[PDB]
Scaffold this active site. Structure first.
Site, short mmCIF file in Angstrom:
data_model
loop_
_atom_site.label_atom_id
_atom_site.label_comp_id
_atom_site.label_asym_id
_atom_site.label_seq_id
_atom_site.Cartn_x
_atom_site.Cartn_y
_atom_site.Cartn_z
N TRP A 165 0.84 -1.18 0.00
CA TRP A 165 0.00 0.00 0.00
C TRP A 165 0.88 1.23 0.00
CZ3 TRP A 165 -1.43 3.12 4.66
CH2 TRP A 165 -2.49 3.98 4.42
N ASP A 177 -0.59 -3.83 10.76
CA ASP A 177 -1.59 -2.98 10.11
C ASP A 177 -2.74 -3.90 9.73
OD1 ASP A 177 -3.19 -1.51 8.33
OD2 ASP A 177 -1.46 -0.58 7.32
N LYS A 220 -13.07 0.00 6.19
CA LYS A 220 -13.56 -1.04 5.32
C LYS A 220 -14.54 -1.92 5.99
CE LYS A 220 -9.38 0.42 3.59
NZ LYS A 220 -7.93 0.17 3.73
#
Lengths: 399, 399
Positions: A132, A213, A248
């Site tokens: 990312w 993460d 999300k």
């Protein structure tokens, strides 16, 4: 010689070029697989039932909107820790976990990064190859040199675990290792529980600082199973940083709801660490916003609302899986040379399709289907309305 | 050897100690003048009618929650510029003004500071003597050395304007000067319009970077008048940074709604500056939260809501004025020989009472009235139910 005369135009995100071309494309049937959100069949973002329900109940209370604590809503902070570590965590019971509400997973990374910089500004940060995009950007802006550990293996569509472990086995004490908990972004390639155990053992032996993460808890196997990596580190008596996000999992991207959690050795150490984390937050944005966190806290505290959330997030998990398997079946039936079985092994919102940049360009020009130049596709942007269009276009490009 | 073993316990915020003392006082006539928020006649933080209505409309609409642009809701950014500079600003028309939605006034200061550090990391930052505590802390954490310009004059209850101008005239090119637009926090001592004109002249002549902080637009004289300092810098064609907050003026503290605006020399320079500001935002918290910004945008866009807001902001402004004059009148009636005129001259939520630390101690011990050790009081914490107890206590401590 004016104040801004030497200011350059910042580097362009390569996504902006994709979005510009997609937007200019006058064909009415075009598909954007370069996005990074979960959509419905109209190409739009869902509002979860539990979120709608919670918001309706809360707005009727007409509450004042004074400042939150620096570290956010305490009940939210507590619920996040239980969601990550389990209701019966001995670390929580011993007061060893610090959790501060944050501006999404990104904000959690930032506050962690800034605090880490005060602890040892000579530490390097190691990220997955690839990761990312904002991992490298964030830690570099926070003052760190960023390096990459081998991870994605384009030859196998899996993980080069030997290369990863060998990299970790060469990192110096204090190196900050940014580890996706699950649902790897951007490749979808994840470690298994046994590879995770090796990672934990090396981080421990080499005194590395793990920075987990966890942006997709619930999109991989289950809410509880997707926390496994975080819990393995917790069980190892390590100091662990965890950036978590509800962007999300609650479809709450634009309310900026996440958390930074830190595992410390003692209650005293937790108090010291929190006290310093508060300084780093306060001099950035003072205290966090209320709405998103209050809603997540409300959903997690209500058995009915929480069950509705669990159900809906499960439907989203399962729809992605249905699209993955539907694409695999279709490309098989289509008689394609390349075996796309790896699409079922990849998890979360993304897959590295393995399309070359040339094939991606053809897919765009010939078919109005937009993948990233790396071959990345958002499988979460596939649905029963575009699945066949996309599969047939891929079959056409692959010959 | 453990990672957090050198982490010290940060010094605790003295205001928490004051609040905890206040809460441990059993006297029901007690009053906390150490607060930092507006409360109404009933002693509550108001939920403004316009906000109530906008929030209800937003929530009941059932809207999804995708990511906002990095620089926030464009319509909100546009409304902010016109609120600050006026609808007919030729700088707005020319595309010269950059505005990004920010996490309150604090967030706007942070993003501006981080951007400024990239421009010239050796610049110093000058703040008023005294100033809102987070000015020094924020700019220090962002990597600047912070100095103070003479400002508040304890002997006159006014401004040491000669000392202020002498300080600015001694500063090197590039020095960033943080200037409160009105309602000085924490003293309530404001510059007059002849004084502002001279400040602009010196900032220009000495090539200083003005950073205006406007957190109380509407609490001084009027929405339009309160922006006068900002407009004076804009009219002078200076590159000016402006942190603006809606925390107070919308009573939306906990939703983190503010903005950073920067005046540039051209449309092209605005594009380059915005691009760099985006980079500073993206690597901090990605993009801003929706709820409070959506509410502000709606209020400013809906004629009926904007009119309600103007009225209610005016009522808050007027109530503080009523409290200041009511205090002055009661101290006079109690036979206090001291000139408290300055309480009527000073503007916004705060005043330096001029009480010594020892007199503040006695107000607490004898009367349960809690003022900051500096003598700062929050005049917005006064209402008709506590004005006499406060005035009577202050009178008792002043012979």
């Amino acid at each position: 010689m004016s104040l801004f005369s030497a200011v350059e135009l910042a580097p362009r995100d390569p996504i902006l070029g994709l979005n510009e071309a997609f937007n200019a494309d006058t064909r009415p049937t075009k598909v954007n697989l370069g996005v990074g959100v979960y959509t419905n069949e109209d190409g739009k973002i869902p509002l979860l039932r539990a979120v709608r329900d919670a918001e309706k109940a809360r707005v009727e209370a007409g509450l004042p909107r004074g400042y939150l604590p620096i570290d956010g809503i305490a009940a939210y902070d507590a619920s996040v820790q239980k969601l990550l570590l389990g209701d019966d965590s001995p670390l929580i019971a011993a007061g060893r976990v610090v959790t501060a509400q944050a501006l999404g997973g990104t904000g959690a990374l930032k506050i962690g990064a800034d605090f880490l910089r005060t602890l040892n500004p000579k530490a390097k940060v190691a990220i997955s190859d690839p990761s990312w995009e904002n991992h490298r950007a964030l830690f570099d802006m926070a003052g760190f040199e960023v390096v990459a550990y081998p991870y994605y293996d384009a030859k196998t569509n899996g993980v080069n675990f030997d290369g990863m472990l060998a990299a970790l086995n060469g990192y110096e004490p204090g190196t900050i290792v940014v580890l996706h908990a699950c649902c790897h972004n951007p490749t979808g390639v994840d470690l298994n529980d046994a590879q995770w155990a090796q990672v934990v053992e090396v981080v421990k032996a080499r005194r590395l600082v793990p920075f987990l993460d966890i942006a997709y808890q619930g999109f991989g196997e289950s809410i509880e199973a997707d926390a496994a990596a975080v819990r393995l580190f917790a069980a190892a008596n390590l100091n662990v940083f965890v950036s978590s996000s509800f962007s999300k999992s609650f479809s709450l991207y634009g309310e900026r709801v996440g958390a930074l959690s830190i595992i410390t050795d003692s209650k005293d150490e937790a108090a010291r660490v929190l006290s310093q984390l508060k300084r780093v937050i306060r001099t950035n944005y003072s205290n966090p916003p209320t709405h998103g966190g209050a809603i997540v806290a409300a959903v997690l505290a209500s058995p009915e609302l929480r069950a509705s959330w669990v159900q809906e997030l499960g439907e989203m998990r399962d729809r992605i899986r249905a699209m993955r398997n539907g694409l695999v079946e279709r490309l098989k039936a289509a008689g394609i040379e390349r075996d796309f079985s790896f699409i079922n092994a990849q998890r979360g919102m993304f897959s590295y399709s393995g399309l070359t940049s040339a094939q991606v360009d053809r897919l765009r020009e010939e078919f109005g289907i937009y993948a990233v130049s790396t071959g990345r596709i958002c499988v979460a942007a596939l649905n029963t309305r575009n699945l066949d269009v996309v599969a047939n276009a891929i079959a056409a490009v692959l010959k």
